[PDB]
Amino acid sequence: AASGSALIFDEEMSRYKLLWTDPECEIEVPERLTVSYEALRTHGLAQRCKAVPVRQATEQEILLAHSEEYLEAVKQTPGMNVEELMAFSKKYNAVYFHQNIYHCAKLAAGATLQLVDSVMKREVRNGMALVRPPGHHSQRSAANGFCVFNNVAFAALYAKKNYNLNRILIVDWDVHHGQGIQYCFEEDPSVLYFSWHRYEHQSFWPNLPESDYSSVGKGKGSGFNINLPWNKVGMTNSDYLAAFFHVLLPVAYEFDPELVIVSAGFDSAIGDPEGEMCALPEIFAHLTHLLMPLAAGKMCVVLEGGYNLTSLGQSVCQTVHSLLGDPTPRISGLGTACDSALESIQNVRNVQSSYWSSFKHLAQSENDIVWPEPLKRMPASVRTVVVPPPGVELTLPKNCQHSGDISESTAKEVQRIRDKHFHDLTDQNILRSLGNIISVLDRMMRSDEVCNGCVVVSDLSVSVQCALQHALTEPAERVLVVYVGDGELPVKTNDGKVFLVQICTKETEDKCVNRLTLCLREGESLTAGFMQALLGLILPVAYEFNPALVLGIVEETTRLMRVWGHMTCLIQGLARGRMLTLLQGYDKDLLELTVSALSGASISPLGPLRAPKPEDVEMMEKQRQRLQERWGLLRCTVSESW
Ligand SMILES: O=C(NO)C1CCN(CCNCc2ccccc2)CC1
Numbered sequence: 001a002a003s004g005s006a007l008i009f010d011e012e013m014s015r016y017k018l019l020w021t022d023p024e025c026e027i028e029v030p031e032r033l034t035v036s037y038e039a040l041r042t043h044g045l046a047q048r049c050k051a052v053p054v055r056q057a058t059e060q061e062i063l064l065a066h067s068e069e070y071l072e073a074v075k076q077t078p079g080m081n082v083e084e085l086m087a088f089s090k091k092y093n094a095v096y097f098h099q100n101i102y103h104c105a106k107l108a109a110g111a112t113l114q115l116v117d118s119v120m121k122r123e124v125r126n127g128m129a130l131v132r133p134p135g136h137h138s139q140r141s142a143a144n145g146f147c148v149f150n151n152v153a154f155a156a157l158y159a160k161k162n163y164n165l166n167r168i169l170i171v172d173w174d175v176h177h178g179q180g181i182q183y184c185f186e187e188d189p190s191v192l193y194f195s196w197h198r199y200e201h202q203s204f205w206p207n208l209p210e211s212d213y214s215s216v217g218k219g220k221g222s223g224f225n226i227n228l229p230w231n232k233v234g235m236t237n238s239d240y241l242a243a244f245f246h247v248l249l250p251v252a253y254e255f256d257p258e259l260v261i262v263s264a265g266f267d268s269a270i271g272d273p274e275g276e277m278c279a280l281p282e283i284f285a286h287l288t289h290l291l292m293p294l295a296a297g298k299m300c301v302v303l304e305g306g307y308n309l310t311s312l313g314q315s316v317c318q319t320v321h322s323l324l325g326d327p328t329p330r331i332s333g334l335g336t337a338c339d340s341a342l343e344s345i346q347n348v349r350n351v352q353s354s355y356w357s358s359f360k361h362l363a364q365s366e367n368d369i370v371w372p373e374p375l376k377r378m379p380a381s382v383r384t385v386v387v388p389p390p391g392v393e394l395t396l397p398k399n400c401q402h403s404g405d406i407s408e409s410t411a412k413e414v415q416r417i418r419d420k421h422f423h424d425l426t427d428q429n430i431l432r433s434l435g436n437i438i439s440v441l442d443r444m445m446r447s448d449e450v451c452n453g454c455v456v457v458s459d460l461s462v463s464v465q466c467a468l469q470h471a472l473t474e475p476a477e478r479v480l481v482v483y484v485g486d487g488e489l490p491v492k493t494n495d496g497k498v499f500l501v502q503i504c505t506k507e508t509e510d511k512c513v514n515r516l517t518l519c520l521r522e523g524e525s526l527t528a529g530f531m532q533a534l535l536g537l538i539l540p541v542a543y544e545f546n547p548a549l550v551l552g553i554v555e556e557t558t559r560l561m562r563v564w565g566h567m568t569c570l571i572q573g574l575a576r577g578r579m580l581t582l583l584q585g586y587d588k589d590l591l592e593l594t595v596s597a598l599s600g601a602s603i604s605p606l607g608p609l610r611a612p613k614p615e616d617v618e619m620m621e622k623q624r625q626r627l628q629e630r631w632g633l634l635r636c637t638v639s640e641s642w
């Protein structure tokens with residue numbers, strides 16, 4: 001299994017620049033690259049990646065996406081003087097040329113292909129190419145918007161040809177619409193293209209009618225193009241995450257790509273002069289994290305735009321941190337997307353409901369700038385501690401560790417707790433269980449030496465109490481509890497400090513807005529129903545709740561095995577990954593699977609997802625209706641005003 005992250009960069013790509021005055025192009029500077037790489041070096045991230053050399057894309061490779069006539073014209077620019085370069089540039093929209101730009105365009109494209117090869121050959125898990133010129137505007141026979149050749153369209157066409165992939169996802173989170181990519185794959189169902197972009201009702205560059213939500217692709221590609229137009233500036237973390245939870249991720253996990261390529265422009269970040277959005281650099285840590293359970297983690301991130309040198313460096317680091325597996329930062333202050341974003345989200349979900357099973361229920365009546373520097377992200381010395389039953393030895397990943405050695409002081413705390421709340425209990429195994437929970441929780445919270453952990457236990461009720469109560473006093477301001485099982489637990493959700501997600505089998509009426517109870521019909525379609533609930537209900541609430549600890553609980557009485565790995569991976573977006581899972585009873589497969597996802601290993605794909613049953617969808621949309629007034633990140637429609 002593959003490990004490591006590639007970082008592909010070469011100083012040569014900073015060796016072209018604008019040679020005449022032009023306020024439109026003067027923002028695209030060599031320093032975008034040098035400042036980004038130097039920020040990765042300053043934070044120690046470059047040193048932790050496998051440096052892979054750039055190469056030139058060959059003529060045959062360029063012709064995958066571009067016409068001979070355009071290639072021949074561009075091939076002439078190294079021989080042009082400044083006057084001739086200016087006149088050549090003016091044939092195109094928002095683009096300038098330089099004696100060295102043809103050379104650099106072949107390097108940006110080849111660097112992208114080097115990244116695809118490193119990932120598809122399992123030489124690294126994932127990676128990023130820091131390249132310029134960018135690519136996503138370039139078209140079959142035209143340069144456009146700083147772009148000469150279409151780096152990301154190369155990557156998908158190359159991965160199709162050389163690795164015979166049938167399903168590729170392209171996520172374009174640059175603030176501009178990648179119309180070059182859209183045109184390239186408009187009729188191709190093997191490449192799913194998602195783009196969000198500043199649009200402002202077509203008044204924002206590139207001013208195209210086909211950048212709107214109504215372009216779903218053409219012919220056999222209908223449904224495999226997803227445009228999400230932003231019709232106001234100032235979109236926030238909540239707008240971006242609502243886009244991911246209610247549009248992109250439902251489609252992404254149903255499509256089940258074999259490779260994910262990100263057109264990663266950071267002009268969608270706060271402070272950028274072209275985007276004018278307000279999302280913090282930390283959001284890209286989460287956009288990256290939420291895509292990583294796809295395609296067994298095979299993700300190629302390709303730099304596009306981003307023009308505020310400060311937010312550019314910070315956003316590049318947040319992404320690579322996430323590619324390397326470092327704990328995600330906590331995002332505070334989340335809530336409802338704004339009305340304009342809810343309108344775009346609602347319109348795209350509705351036009352796409354003909355094509356995607358997560359939206360199908362919508363079709364029938366039955367239904368300068370300043371911001372705080374991001375905090376440091378340290379990988380934990382031991383990521384995951386594990387406490388199997390006594391005597392059970394397991395082969396663990398290199399970043400996991402057993403931990404049964406109860407201290408002296410911890411053992412005094414257990415005696416304390418027994419005397420006070422469970423005077424009538426002497427089962428010395430359950431009492432060892434409590435020692436393990438407390439000692440694991442102390443390592444997780446009191447230090448950056450451990451990130452998360454998993455304990456096998458005998459008795460749920462006393463285990464849950466000690467875990468929850470010990471976390472609350474530490475103090476952890478808020479705790480998210482995810483419980484797979486039936487019956488009530490010793491959990492009080494009345495003070496706002498706990499949110500309880502419960503996945504059960506008996507339909508229990510929901511009282512308060514600090515509980516989400518999902519009773520899913522057992523059968524063939526349990527997997528799709530759980531994923532739909534996870535992406536559209538559990539993650540939105542969890543992200544808004546913003547817990548300091550996640551507590552997972554699995555009752556011994558398990559169609560879990562299909563989807564427990566995806567939940568465990570995705571739920572580490574909360575609480576900087578600090579999650580404690582309690583497994584009742586020994587189940588080797590479940591224990592190994594939990595430890596694997598907790599430890600940052602790649603998650604195996606679910607396969608293309610069949611459809612959820614209507615009874616389950618109705619159940620989930622009733623939960624949304626009940627909860628979205630309190631938890632606004634659940635909203636995916638505009639609210640009715642009085
Ligand atoms: O980041 C990017 N693509 O991802 C680029 C793409 C094109 N932009 C320039 C477009 N300027 C249009 C314009 C011209 C004249 C008056 C007003 C507006 C800059 C960022």
Ligand SMILES: [K+]
Pocket residue numbers: 172173174175176177178195196197
């Ligand atoms: K975009």
Ligand SMILES: [K+]
Pocket residue numbers: 185186187188189190191192193217221224225
């Ligand atoms: K397509």
Ligand code: NA
Pocket residue numbers: 089090092093094095
């Ligand atoms: Na021009």
Ligand SMILES: [Zn+2]
Pocket residue numbers: 174175176265267304305306
């Ligand atoms: Zn852009």
